Amino acid sequence: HRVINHPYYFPFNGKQAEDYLRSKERGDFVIRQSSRGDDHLAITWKLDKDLFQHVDIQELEKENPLALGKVLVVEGQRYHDLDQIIVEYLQNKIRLLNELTSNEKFKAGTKKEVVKFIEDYSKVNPKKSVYYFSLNYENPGWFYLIFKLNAESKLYIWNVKLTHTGFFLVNYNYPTVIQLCNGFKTLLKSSNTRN
Amino acid sequence: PSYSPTSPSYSPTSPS
């Protein structure tokens, strides 16, 4: 619970940890109490100037939840302390963010820009199809996956969750953006074997 | 929002 002493810790509310990071960088993180137990904590991490996601933690290996767990569990994986879950979860998450953002499949940086880039890329190519990944603003910690058959077509979107273990979509995690592209291909083939 | 998974498949709409 709120007994953390780490330099990334803040007793701030979820809105306060947000508005704190909204004054920080395109990559930010602060530890704060969880809304679902004393054996639980959270990390609020920032993706863009006004975009953030909460990631709960469980303080495992303690006889009482009033006591600080000898381990910290994140997305179902244990670690020795908050500084381990932060370096592991953040640095792995941030490198996956560099490989996705550097990907040719990744669109622009903010809603307006990506909607302008997908529509512009669709209308300048009104007979070619369009499919790109970008930040999701209604569902942080997930990236949106916009698809159009062409300029004259409707628009469809799906999502991929970001995790320090990779990218998670439909039902499985891919430890790198390249494997996410393989996941998408093996999944569309499993979908084409139905359509 | 922030706690609401949703994602349909790639939808290849073709023999891909």
Side-chain angles (χ1 to χ4, degrees):
Chain A
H1 56 80
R2 52 263 160 201
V3 70
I4 269 52
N5 291 299
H6 296 77
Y8 313 120
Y9 178 51
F10 287 86
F12 294 169
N13 180 273
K15 279 297 308 86
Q16 180 180 16
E18 169 199 354
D19 301 338
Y20 168 94
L21 53 76
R22 303 207 288 114
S23 182
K24 204 112 316 194
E25 262 293 355
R26 274 54 59 90
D28 192 19
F29 47 86
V30 294
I31 292 162
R32 59 86 168 157
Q33 171 60 45
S34 170
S35 183
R36 55 183 55 69
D38 291 4
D39 52 313
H40 302 84
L41 230 65
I43 283 162
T44 69
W45 142 81
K46 181 174 166 198
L47 319 182
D48 190 14
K49 222 303 305 170
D50 301 292
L51 185 64
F52 61 104
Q53 175 59 28
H54 313 291
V55 177
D56 283 39
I57 303 149
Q58 187 166 25
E59 302 182 358
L60 180 62
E61 201 153 325
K62 213 67 258 290
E63 68 299 316
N64 293 173
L66 282 296
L68 180 61
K70 297 208 298 79
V71 279
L72 289 302
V73 177
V74 174
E75 300 187 353
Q77 309 178 17
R78 70 191 281 137
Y79 298 91
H80 190 193
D81 190 19
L82 279 304
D83 60 359
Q84 309 306 302
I85 75 177
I86 194 84
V87 297
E88 292 292 350
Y89 193 85
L90 277 288
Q91 298 289 358
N92 289 297
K93 173 66 65 64
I94 294 168
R95 63 146 286 182
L96 293 165
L97 182 147
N98 299 336
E99 58 188 78
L100 82 85
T101 191
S102 58
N103 195 2
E104 64 159 39
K105 305 307 188 195
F106 177 77
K107 261 279 170 293
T110 189
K111 183 182 294 293
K112 165 250 147 169
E113 298 295 352
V114 14
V115 299
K116 285 262 62 281
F117 192 11
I118 197 96
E119 74 94 334
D120 289 343
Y121 174 99
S122 76
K123 61 126 159 293
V124 299
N125 303 301
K127 299 293 171 183
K128 315 308 302 178
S129 306
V130 201
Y131 180 54
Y132 290 81
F133 321 158
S134 188
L135 290 165
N136 191 311
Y137 313 89
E138 299 70 29
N139 305 266
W142 296 72
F143 280 63
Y144 104 147
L145 305 168
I146 170 67
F147 186 102
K148 317 176 71 187
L149 289 77
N150 68 318
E152 306 162 326
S153 182
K154 226 290 193 179
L155 69 93
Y156 324 85
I157 315 176
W158 37 100
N159 303 291
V160 57
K161 178 181 179 299
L162 264 287
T163 168
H164 66 296
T165 304
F167 303 80
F168 176 95
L169 67 317
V170 177
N171 54 23
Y172 190 66
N173 45 213
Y174 296 91
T176 177
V177 69
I178 297 176
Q179 294 288 14
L180 170 65
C181 295
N182 301 335
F184 276 140
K185 290 157 182 52
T186 197
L187 280 168
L188 65 84
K189 185 81 289 184
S190 178
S191 306
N192 174 215
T193 52
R194 307 290 184 266
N195 186 171
Chain B
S2 77
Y3 294 136
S4 56
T6 282
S7 183
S9 183
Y10 197 107
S11 175
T13 70
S14 60
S16 302

